[PDB]
Amino acid sequence: TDITGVCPDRFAAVREVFEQNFADGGELGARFAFAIEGEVVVDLMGGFADRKRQVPFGPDTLTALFSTTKAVAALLIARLVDEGRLAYDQAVADVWPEFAQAGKDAVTVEQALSHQAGLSGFPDETDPAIWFDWDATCAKLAAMAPLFPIGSASGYHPVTYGYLAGEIFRRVDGRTMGTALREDICEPLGLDLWIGLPDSEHDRVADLMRPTAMPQFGEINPAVEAAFFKPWSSPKGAAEWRRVEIPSANGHATAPALARLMGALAHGGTLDGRSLITPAGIKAATAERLRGRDLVLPYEISWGAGFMRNEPNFYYGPTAEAFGHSGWGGSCAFADPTRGVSGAYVMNKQGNALIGDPRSVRLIEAAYASL
Incomplete structure (x- = not known):
């Protein structure tokens, strides 16, 4: 496997682990990025964008992020709260009366x-x-x-979750999450990250291997049943699924774009000199809301306001109060925030670990062991 990109001598262990992930058919294509104080320091690429293994997984290759998108939705809400346009302890019904x-x-x-809020999925025939009908989905949740x-x-x-977060955002901000993300963050800062992907970008989207x-x-x-095991639990064709906004599942990005944003x-709260959010706003968004066995994901999870906190599973490295989403x-x-580092692993060969896929965990652990 040809591994390419940037990886200083300090992070040689990351390149070694990355190369090993491709051994014995562990990958199709992947990119791993690691950032220190918002600056990408490791950015490695390997393997293929396409199932035929004829196209390299490269600098402009986009991949569906699925629920990693939820970290972006959480950030967009955290900004509204930090700006004083919304409060975390405000009733949803206050901005969305039908709720x-x-x-x-x-x-x-x-x-x-x-x-x-008990809306993990629709239990009834749907x-x-x-x-694909934003208003009909939100109406069903509201009821x-x-x-x-x-x-x-x-x-x-x-x-x-993406409709809950997205509709709160839309009613308060005015714009959809994907539009605000593009206008306020990704266009000014040059981040290759999208919620709602125009057709012009579809040709550089990687194939997925299920x-x-x-x-x-x-x-x-009943919660796990409704969330995952109904005929309607998951969302027409690939192009429309890319085009619409599903802030719980259909973001598209490169690994460095996510590493810079989380950086x-x-x-x-600052990226390339631009304040996205205050330190107070970051702290409010990531504080533990509750912790314990999740009714749907088979793990003990500590949840912030849409972000998964790192303890008790430590899939994002050794810092208990680190946070993100998988x-x-x-x-x-x-x-x-404690060590000043961030990262992202983005790949197109899907494993069956809901969180803590060992390909990503080994890379993050190697990065931390290099510090």
């Missing part, structure tokens, strides 16, 4: 973003194309009765 139905009139923003109580256990919302075997969920319950959260098949992006 008050079925007893949800007191659910707060931070409760929704930490998977407490058209599987509803997800839905929660599947479990606030402040009991989190029950990860794999798809619905998992060899299903992930091993925990005990069945700003690791470096006082994606279906193995991608991830994280920030460590």
Whole structure:
């Protein structure tokens, strides 16, 4: 396997681990980026963008991020709160009056973003194309009765979270998340990161290789059932799925784009001299809302306001208070404000680890062991 990119002598262990991930068919293509105070210092590429292995996974290759996108949604909300346009303990119904139905009139923003609001999936018969109709999806969520109580256990919302976060954002900011992301962050800072991908970018999107075997969920319950095991649990063709905005699942990016964005959260909220958020705003967004066994993801999880915190599983390295989010098949992006570092692993061969895919964990551990 030809590994290319930048990797200083200080991070030689990262290149070694990266090369080993490609051994014995562990990859199709992948990119790993590691940043110190917002500056990308490691950016390695290997393998192929296409299932035929005829096209290199290269500098402009975009990949679907799946739930790694949720870290971007969380940041966009965190900015609204930091700007004083929204408060984490504000009732969702205050900005989205229709949400008050079925007893949800007191659910707060931070409760929704930490998977407490009981809307992990639709339990009842649902058209599987509803997800392509933003208004119909939000209307169904607004009318839905929660599947479990606030402040009991989190029950990860794999798809619905993007509509909860996105609609709160839209009603407060005015723009969609993807539009604000592009206008306020990605265009000015030159980040190759998108929610809602125009057709002109589709030719550089990597093929995906679907998992060899299903992930091993925990005990069945109505939340995991609705979230993952219905005919309608997941979202028409590949181009429309790219074009629309699904802030829980359909972001597209390169690994350095995510490492730079999370790097700003690791470096006082500033990226290339531009303040995205205050330190106070970062601290408010990442504070633990609750911790314990998740009803949907088969893990003990400490949730911030949409960010996954690192303890107790340490899939983002050794710092307990680091944070980020991981994606279906193995991608991830994280920030460590304590050490000032950030990183992202973006690949197109999907594994069956819902979080903590060992390809990403080994790379992050090698990066930290190089510090």
